[PDB]
Design a protein around this ligand. Structure first.
Ligand code: HEM
Ligand code: HEM
Ligand code: HEM
Ligand code: HEM
Lengths: 158, 158, 158, 158, 158, 158, 158
């Protein structure tokens, strides 16, 4: 079904966001794993899988709408060298994507692409979830201190 | 453990190869899926997962060897517009990566990084497997003709 | 038990036939497999196993009859380069072996080696079965055409 | 994938070795069985199956590398007339094949056919295993004497 | 159904053979058992049961063909006083019966009693099996010596 | 099979390394256990078992190659009096053994003892694993502080 | 709990005995295994595990008593080149350790270290068991002769 061009541009832009997130989350995950921070590896890995699911949904939708999914261009990764810096970087990234999602959703509504909108709102709900988790972790680091926070990541949560 | 610098460069280059393959295979997969070529979607999807496993192994190894995995730079994707063109493009990609793998393996041996070598030989064996599958599909297309080949992709293989 | 010498010669000759068939069927099988003709690989492989069972029975019988099984001499393989040619070659081979079997059976009867005869008649019945299958495949190729025939070999039969 | 020609020659030569071993082990097996040496029949039979697995791997690899597997030429079998002679003959055969394998492995490495190499190293490890078993049996025959050794072969090992 | 008279004579003669074998095998069995040669008792007992099955088949066939089964006349038993002598005696007996069977089979064919023939060929195959076993035991006795052979009969084979 | 003498010397030297590691890991384990550091006892104990498996493989291989395994000479243990010191000492030991392994592997390749090489590469991969674990623990001690690190060892990991 | 110094010296001396036994039994085991003496490998291996258990108990007890377990010094191994010699050597070793154990037990009683005593008496009971087994094997070798004894080791005991 031939979709609205600008919706497809938005879908590719959102896809672009998820594909930086996929990589940034995966590197973070295995960095944590290397450091023995088993629990942060588990969560961030699962967030990488999450963003993959999102990318998949965009790709399928762009294809359905008869556009060309763009997996060639990759935005700036910001990796960071310590836990806080890396968590903070994932948070900034989620925040910029939420912003883009809010914009795309409003526009999809105005051209009547209600199913693209509906798919985007579910994705935003997952992002808003990641935002919740990242914010909480960052606050825990301040409240309990860095040493205690690290000790609490050594064992995976059952 | 501080690894050999040039081994790490090779590992990042190989990682680079897998990360273009991951995307190219995934897009191909969902293109096939959109076209209703269910079987080609199943196989190519499973090859995308495969290349992810490889990327993961490189990332973990670079990290262990104390280098910086590079997920920022992404090489040229070549997507193609029909089945043959797309299969042929995946084949050219596997062929270039096999070449890089052969080179890296020889060098790892000469600096005594036998475990990096061992990991790379297993990966090359998986690639060589994908090469086998792609070559066979491309020959089937010529032997049975394009129409018959497409009909044979409509149902997933149990 | 000391057997009739000429029966043993026949047994070795028949053994010789099975041992060329074993190899020819196995190579054909893996050629088909390489080409992705999964179904022809399954059947021809199972025919290779079949001829092995036959060879085993000859070997045991020659030994029981106190002769020397001959596994040293190997007759002409005729491999062929395409499906028809290869199928036709297996058929010619079965036909020559059936001829030898008919001759050996008649002779075993006339020297009263009824158990060798009985074993040979069961083998001939298996060969006659392979002959049936090969003839049918070759006719299917003409009736449905080569392209359709090949497409029909891509998936293994459950 | 077009392989190195000389690698293919080596693969065919190794294949040639396995195919003499297949037959020599099988005849030995059924000779032992006829003599009631149940245990030697069980082991040697299982070694025949082993060499078949090896031949299969060569055949598939030659085919993948786009060469012509050679099952037509069969090297000298040396059967022998008693246990020691026959065991010793299998040992000489394994020793010559190990020699060929060592040469092929070194050459595969130097043309970068690392997966052929990897396959060959696993095969050599199985051969080295057969060598171990044969050497041990031959020493047992001297240590316990031939009569005791034979009595020990009458019952199959659970 | 009124059978050929001479076929019935042959059937009774063969029956006569089995009925001496039944007794000779049973006595041998329980002699071995008494001597503690548990394994030879197991096998020879099972051969006695075997010959009973054969007698049964003759009896039923003679009756079907409307003749009178003869269980009154019993040929010469040759018991023997030691293992070798007794094994050798069972072997001579099987050899004479195989001779009779060969003759009967040829004659049944020439009067078209194909089912009597078919029954006789299966019996001959069982006899040929007993012949194999006896020959092997007698050769084992020479190869491993009498003392070792006896020790090997003390425990039953699982 | 008569092996290369210098390969056997290397195998004995590597065996020597594993046998110091076996003892050093076991003492460390039970020291941790005594101190109530349950988790460090579990891991180090499992590393002692690991090094035993390695010693076993060397011993068997030396024996196969017809050399004399040397379990008489035992290198310097360095025990240490606190967690860091003891972990650091295990790390120095793994590092020296990895060095020896790298040398032995290269030499085995040059005399064509590919199966010894293959066994050594698997062992090196296990060592490289222990190196990873030790390095991570030592870094955790600095990152979370000694008191927090110790508290984290009190309970065994499920 | 601060133990008696001389008890700790005894514990270390006994530990020293077990650690030579561990190695001597393990080498013997794998020597038997190499020779195909499967049964002697099974038993001696299990005795090596046994002596490890003993070493473990000493190590834990020395640590509890606040002494320093000594795994650095290793007494004279006496390996031997044939079965008898090797069995005899394990027996001499058990005999010397039993002597040391008797001495240590008496002394532990006189300084009131009743739990060390109790642990040592259980160990002595296990040693006395090994002594029983070794003595019996050595006598069996004389009673049945070396050839028969070896044949009896070829199969593992269920
Ligand atoms: C390039 C860096 C990437 C890495 C390192 C990576 C890694 C992984 C790994 C390790 C898995 C687990 C394999 C499994 O399913 O068992 C996985 C799953 C998956 N990946 Fe990726 N991935 C990457 C990018 C992508 C991309 C670009 C896509 C396409 C949008 C994608 C799609 C998927 C999907 C659909 C799954 C299955 C999720 C599930 O059901 O568990 N991945 N990935
Ligand atoms: C010419 C003398 C040979 C004899 C007497 C022989 C005999 C046998 C027998 C009795 C079996 C057991 C059947 C079964 O799988 O249940 C077997 C299995 C097999 N044979 Fe052969 N064989 C011979 C040569 C070969 C050759 C040349 C090849 C090809 C390389 C081959 C390939 C195989 C394979 C792949 C199996 C299946 C193994 C398994 O999964 O158990 N054989 N053979
Ligand atoms: C005269 C000496 C014989 C002796 C000492 C003997 C002994 C035995 C014994 C101990 C059994 C096992 C009983 C069972 O089935 O549980 C048996 C079975 C049997 N016997 Fe006899 N037998 C003799 C002759 C015969 C004869 C002349 C016939 C008739 C042809 C015969 C027919 C059978 C049959 C049909 C069985 C059953 C086999 C089975 O299913 O296990 N026996 N015999
Ligand atoms: C001398 C100090 C040693 C100590 C204190 C020690 C301790 C232990 C203990 C407690 C076990 C567990 C028993 C079990 O398997 O359930 C074990 C297992 C084992 N040990 Fe040792 N050991 C020592 C040296 C050695 C040596 C030198 C070898 C020979 C290379 C060896 C070979 C083995 C093997 C093969 C196992 C079985 C592993 C398994 O399957 O769990 N050990 N050791």
């Amino acid at each position: 079904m031939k979709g609205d061009t600008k919706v497809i541009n938005y879908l590719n832009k959102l896809l672009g966001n998820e594909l930086v997130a996929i990589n940034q989350y995966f590197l973070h995950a295995r960095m944590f794993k290397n450091w023995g921070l088993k629990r942060l590896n588990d969560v961030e890995y699962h967030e990488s899988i999450d963003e993959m699911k999102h990318a998949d949904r965009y790709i399928e939708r762009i294809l359905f709408l008869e556009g060309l999914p763009n997996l060639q261009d990759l935005g700036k990764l910001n990796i960071g060298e310590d836990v806080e810096e890396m968590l903070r970087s994932d948070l900034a990234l989620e925040l910029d994507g939420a912003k883009n999602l809010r914009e795309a959703i409003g526009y999809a509504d105005s051209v009547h692409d209600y199913v693209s909108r509906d798919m985007m709102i579910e994705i935003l709900r997952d992002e808003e979830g990641h935002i919740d988790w990242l914010e909480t972790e960052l606050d825990l680091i301040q409240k309990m201190g860095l040493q205690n926070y690290l000790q609490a990541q050594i064992r995976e949560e059952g």
